[PDB]
Design a protein around this ligand. Structure first.
Ligand SMILES: Cc1cc2nc3c(=O)[nH]c(=O)nc-3n(C[C@H](O)[C@H](O)[C@H](O)COP(=O)(O)O)c2cc1C
Ligand SMILES: O=[N+]([O-])c1cc([N+](=O)[O-])c(O)c([N+](=O)[O-])c1
Length: 362
């Protein structure tokens, strides 16, 4: 067994390789998209994780795509997050904030001025997002057709990521994870299916990867490369966003480029919740030899699978999502081979303490 052995992850050292995957729970306060004391308790209960990766958090107001998602751009938000990281550290844990811009997966009613959301192109995501009704309850609503970002608006996006990382540092986070997966803004530029731009930000894989790499350089410069992690979902289809006709080659290109920056880790989201083709060991080997930092595998993993891949030297750690929603002390349970609490999907999004902080520990 190696899941319970130490691992150096950038600037910090995890005591085990069982990580908590980023999980949107939509329980923040509005107006203000402010983290709450309840959220602080939720994270504190899971502080035994090798590393906690927070729910996706807005780098700006424009970045908001769901009612209830927190931000990390205002004074009130920074003050709230400082309390949450402090709680995690009080329990000797480590926490990374996942920073994102939802792009076209949003709705005009929650955008600044009630205007249309932005993306690489003016193409509707053809999916749904979550808003809140008059009672504060979560509701699914179709996404609003986005406006294509103009060339001179790109630097502003990079700067928002840069500022959010500076904010993350002050808020006490140990690391930052750039959300470059699951069909959100960065992935929208990476995928040819959602990117029809004719400037230097569209077309070739070099052009499509330009935005995410500019962000990576900006945040490494703002803080430090060993504090930066990135999540990608380069193989398969996620929330209607595929990875083009040459996904494997494009994936390896991106990974080689990320490797040049010497960042802390590469978080590979292997499958959409609806499923996808499994990674071949040959592909894992090609990824392995191209990145020199920590590699985290994710997506419907079993403890057995994690041990198998870590043992083969293909990945270093595994991020569990839904199992962490239902098991605050997942590390102890996996170590003792104890049964897990059953999941209650109806309370994954919105609401309050029920289905959030009421899953018991052993
Ligand atoms: C409720 C819910 C919220 C999610 N929100 C996030 C998120 O904020 N950011 C992210 O990158 N993925 C998110 N995911 C995906 C998870 O991180 C994870 O990759 C996925 O659940 C598959 O892993 P699992 O089988 O261990 O749950 C979410 C999934 C669920 C079920
Ligand atoms: O519906 N959800 O709230 C949701 C949200 C995010 N996100 O980054 O905040 C995801 O990445 C996913 N996802 O791809 O699993 C789902």
């Amino acid at each position: 067994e190696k899941l319970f052995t130490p691992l150096k992850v950038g600037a910090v050292t995890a005591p085990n390789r069982v990580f908590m995957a980023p999980l949107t729970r939509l329980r923040s306060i509005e107006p203000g998209d402010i983290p709450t004391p309840l959220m602080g308790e939720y994270y504190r209960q899971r502080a035994s994780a090798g590393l906690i990766i927070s729910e996706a958090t807005q780098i700006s107001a424009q970045a908001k795509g769901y009612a209830g998602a927190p931000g990390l751009h205002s004074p009130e938000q920074i003050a709230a997050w400082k309390k949450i990281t402090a709680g995690v550290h009080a329990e000797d844990g480590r926490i990374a904030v996942q920073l994102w811009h939802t792009g076209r997966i949003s709705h005009s009613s929650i955008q600044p001025g009630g205007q249309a959301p932005v993306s690489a192109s003016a193409l509707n995501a053809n999916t749904r997002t979550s808003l809140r009704d008059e009672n504060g309850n979560a509701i699914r609503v179709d996404t609003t057709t986005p406006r294509a970002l103009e060339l001179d608006e790109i630097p502003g996006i990079v700067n928002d990521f840069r500022q959010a990382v500076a904010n993350a540092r002050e808020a006490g986070f140990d690391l930052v994870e750039l959300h470059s997966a699951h069909g959100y803004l960065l992935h929208q530029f990476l995928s040819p299916s959602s990117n029809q731009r004719t400037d230097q930000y569209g077309g070739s894989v070099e052009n499509r990867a330009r935005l995410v790499l500019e962000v990576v350089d900006a945040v490494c410069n703002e803080w430090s490369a060993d504090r930066i992690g990135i999540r990608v979902s380069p193989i398969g289809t996620f929330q209607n966003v595929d990875n083009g006709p040459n996904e494997e080659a494009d994936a390896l290109y991106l990974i080689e480029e990320l490797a040049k920056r010497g960042i802390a880790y590469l978080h590979m989201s292997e499958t959409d919740l609806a499923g996808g083709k499994p990674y071949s060991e040959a592909f894992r080997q090609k990824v392995r030899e191209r990145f020199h930092g920590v590699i985290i595998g994710a997506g419907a993993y079993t403890a057995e699978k994690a041990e198998d891949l870590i043992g083969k030297g293909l990945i270093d750690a595994v991020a569990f999502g839904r199992d962490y929603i239902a098991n605050p002390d997942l590390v102890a349970r996996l170590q003792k081979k104890a049964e897990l609490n059953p999941q209650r999907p109806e309370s994954f999004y919105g609401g309050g303490a029920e289905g959030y902080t009421d899953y018991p520990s052993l």
